Amino acid sequence: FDQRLLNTFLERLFTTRSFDSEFKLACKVDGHKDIQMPDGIRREEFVQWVELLPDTQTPSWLGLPNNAERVLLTTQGVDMISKMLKMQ
Amino acid sequence: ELVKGILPRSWSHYTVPAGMTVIQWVSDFSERIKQLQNISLAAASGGAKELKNIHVCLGGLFVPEAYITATRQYVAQANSWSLEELCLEVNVTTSQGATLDACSFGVTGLKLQGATCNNNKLSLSNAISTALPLTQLRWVKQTNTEKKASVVTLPVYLNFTRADLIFTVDFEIATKEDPRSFYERGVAVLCT
């Protein structure tokens, strides 16, 4: 099933459609908007596009459900509480 | 070990998630033994016929994958067919509204992850887990018709670690959901 998931990403991304002006790298990241295939043809334009990526990254960027990080984030926040209390 | 709440190595026989306390294991072990008592109770009182008609918890079985092979072999013997000629059909229904036919076996404790099952049809969900009331496994002769372009093959693991693969299940997706989205969201079934 990991092989099937890897094949799904490869067939979704490596296609002639990737050279289209409306290609979607990710779909419905927050229910409404989607990540757009940059229209540039030079490396500099692609690098700029990465720099303008919003900091609001969610697991839906990866095709995962948005709640997959909820348990991980809560545990990390409690750990950050613990680390402070360990150095007081 | 017990004083440090460490599961003794002499007790760990069946497959267990690495992170399990002796307390959790004792509760899990008690549930497994209770189920084994009922299985032996039916076997002694009734014989093999009761063993076929009793619902089983795949989590409580020490080797759940062997039960699937046993049910596969049982149907093959009753119909004089080969194992490789039998494909597994899954029907999810309420325990009260369930009827077990010759090839049907009842399984309880199966939990769907990231999806809900409604009228034997899968839909993407924002809930972490969904408890399947009663899963019926049917072994029928293979028709080598491939898939209906709306069927996903969900892995069934033993526990949340997804380390041991028990078997696979074919489900029909609902509406116009993309089967690829099911693969990307990690939708699977857990035995416990």
**DSSP string for B82-144:** -GGGEEEEEEEE-STT----TTEEEEE--EEEEEEEETTEEEEEEEEEEE-SEEEEEEEE---
**Integer CA distances (angstroms), B71 to A38, B39, B104, B139, in order:** 53, 15, 9, 8
Structure letter (DSSP) for residue B178: -
- Half-sphere exposure in the Cβ direction for B54 (13 Å, CA): 20
Q: Give the tokens for residue B19.
A: 């992170």
Separation CA B16–CA B159 (nearest Å): 8
Which approach determined this entry? Answer: cryo-EM
Cβ atoms of A54 and A36 within 8 Å: the answer is no
Closest among B82, B76, B108, B85 to B95, alpha carbons compared:
B108
Q: Which helix (H) or strand (E) holds B171?
A: strand B165-173
Q: Are B126 and A64 a contacting pair at CB < 8 A?
A: no
Residue with token string 């959790």: B24
A73 CB near a chain B CB, below 8 Å?
Answer: no
Cβ atoms of B83 and B74 within 8 Å: the answer is no
Residues in chain A: 88
- Give the CA radius of gyration of chain B: 18
Separation CA A64–CA B181 (nearest Å): 9
- 3-state secondary structure (DSSP) of residue B154: strand
- Angle CA B174–B178–B182, to nearest 5: 85
Name the amino acid, one letter, at B116.
T
Nearest CA-CA distance, residue A68 and chain B, Å:
8
Residue with token string 């289209």: A20
Separation CA A71–CA A34 (nearest Å): 25
Q: Are A4 and B183 a contacting pair at CB < 8 A?
A: yes
Closest among B115, B192, B127 to B161, alpha carbons compared:
B192
Name the amino acid, one letter, at A27.
C
Structure letter (DSSP) for residue B191: -
Cβ atoms of B5 and B21 within 8 Å: the answer is yes
Residues of B in contact with A8 (CB under 8 A): 180, 183-184
Q: Give the tokens for residue A69.
A: 């990080």
- Angle CA B41–B46–B51, to nearest 5: 70
Separation CA B103–CA B88 (nearest Å): 10
Residues of A in contact with B185 (CB under 8 A): 63-65
Separation CA B118–CA A41 (nearest Å): 46
Structure letter (DSSP) for residue B186: T
Separation CA A86–CA B18 (nearest Å): 27
Residues of B in contact with A68 (CB under 8 A): 186
By CA distance, what is B167's nearest residue in A?
A1
Residue with token string 């348990």: A71
Q: Are A65 and B185 a contacting pair at CB < 8 A?
A: yes
Separation CA B63–CA B91 (nearest Å): 22
Q: Give the tokens for residue B150.
A: 């709306």
Nearest CA-CA distance, residue B114 and chain A, Å:
8
In B24-45, which positions are buried (b, 16+ CB within 10 angstroms) versus exposed (e)?
Answer: ebeebbeebeebeeebeebeee
Separation CA A70–CA A87 (nearest Å): 27
By CA distance, what is B183's nearest residue in A?
A5
In A38-67, which positions are buried (b, 16+ CB within 10 angstroms) versus exposed (e)?
Answer: beeeeeeeeeeeeeeeeeeeebbeebebeb
Give one DSSP letter per residue of B24-69, joined into a string. Answer: HHHHHHHHHHHHHHHHHHHHHTTTHHHHHHS-EETTTSSSHHHHHH
Nearest CA-CA distance, residue B142 and chain A, Å:
22
Residues of A in contact with B186 (CB under 8 A): 64-65, 68
Separation CA B183–CA A10 (nearest Å): 13
Q: Are B181 and A63 a contacting pair at CB < 8 A?
A: yes
**Integer CA distances (angstroms), A82 to A70, A78, B110, B175, in order:** 19, 6, 36, 46
Separation CA B82–CA B84 (nearest Å): 6
Give one DSSP letter per residue of chain A, joined into a string. Answer: -HHHHHHHHHHHHSSGGGGSTT-EEES-SSSS--EEPP---SHHHHHHHHHT--S---GGGGTS-GGGGHHHHHHHHHHHHHHHHH--
**Cited resolution, angstroms:** 2.8
Of A1, A4, A65, the CB nearest to B114: A65
- Angle CA B36–B42–B166, to nearest 5: 45
Distance from chain centroid for Cα B108: 7
